[PDB]
């Protein structure tokens, strides 16, 4: 049958209480199989299922480093959205990124995802073509313009059609955001 991998990245700015809390959870099919927390005593990716504990320490070391880098990716874009909406830097705000892929019985890609939400409302999302974007408001339309100009959609498209399919096939044995300034919010 068909399968699905899905990651959820949430960053919540706590003004005066330190740098925003970063959390990343993963879902193979529809089971939470991995999880990262920045407020943990030893912040790293953790296996949330017994069948992921078989992975070597090299694997966990690699995927953790991405999250710690993604944590830096979100703190920067939180500053941007703070200015885009003309909000004060003394309030709490949340930036969310959802991505993953649906596959078929063949094993090939069926649908890729790349969605961004701010304060619980939709912002910008990758279309089914994996080439165009759908913006929610005017501020996101400003974001889409530079993303179509830089071709940020082709960054994720290689992931969704690539290792996202491959990593899903791997976990069934029973990545991050671009750092091009124009490809940012």
């Amino acid at each position, epitope marked *: 049958g068909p399968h699905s991998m899905r990651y959820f990245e949430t960053a919540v700015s706590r003004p005066g209480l330190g740098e925003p809390r970063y959390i990343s959870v993963g879902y193979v099919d529809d089971k939470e199989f991995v999880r990262f927390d920045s407020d943990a005593e030893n912040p790293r990716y953790e296996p949330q299922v017994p069948w992921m504990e078989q992975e070597g320490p090299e694997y966990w070391e690699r995927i953790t480093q991405v999250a710690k880098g993604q*944590e830096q990716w979100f703190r920067v874009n939180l500053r941007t959205l703070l200015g885009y909406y003309n909000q004060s830097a003394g309030g709490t705000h949340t930036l969310q990124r959802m991505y993953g892929c649906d596959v078929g019985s063949d094993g090939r890609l069926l649908r890729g995802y790349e969605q961004f939400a701010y304060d619980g409302c939709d912002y910008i999302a990758l279309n089914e073509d994996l080439r165009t974007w759908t913006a929610a408001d005017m501020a996101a339309q400003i974001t889409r313009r530079k993303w179509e100009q830089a071709g940020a959609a082709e*960054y994720y498209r290689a992931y969704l059609e690539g290792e996202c399919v491959e990593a899903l096939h791997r976990y069934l044995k029973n990545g991050g955001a671009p750092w*091009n300034p124009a490809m940012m919010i």
Partner: T-cell receptor
Amino acid sequence: SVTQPDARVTVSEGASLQLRCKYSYSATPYLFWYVQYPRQGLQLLLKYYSGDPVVQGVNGFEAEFSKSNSSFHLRKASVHWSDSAVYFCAVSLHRPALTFGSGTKVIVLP
Amino acid sequence: AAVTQSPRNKVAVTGGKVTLSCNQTNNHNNMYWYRQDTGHGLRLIHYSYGAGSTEKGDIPDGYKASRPSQENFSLILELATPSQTSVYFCASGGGGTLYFGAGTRLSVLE
């Protein structure tokens, strides 16, 4: 991945200089050109991430980006003898850190 | 520049403890440690996102990193090997662009 296929370039003075740099990425990465004059640190010539694919730099150096060719070639119409140095092509995309090419030493012959 | 390394020259010994230090005055959150070897250009060893942060580079084996403050990023060679004989560069990482230091020549002999 980043490749500077020419490790060495020997040119006559006043001629044209073309330093070659290709990158192995599915999308436009943050590109840089650093120069290392003999017994000196690294100095930035130019960079690109969006906008005009042709970027001007100091010392009469211009670099052209080609998404099709996936290259960031560094060109100069008339090279001086003082330009004899080593040029590095850097790249950033997946991480906020720069991955470097193997560098190219240029030797202007007077 | 506003990025300084100490020492600039160090004669080490196989098995000895070597510590490279890099201070900055730019408030750049990111700091980097590279080494240069002919035929390989510039390779990444360790970097940092801020005070207390330590991230592995492309070739971290043999080296240890330390970020005690925003300004200081240190490289620690506990067991010095002749393979660690190279020229080392430090950097500050405000945004995507990088600002290098004058570099440090390290030789490890038997």
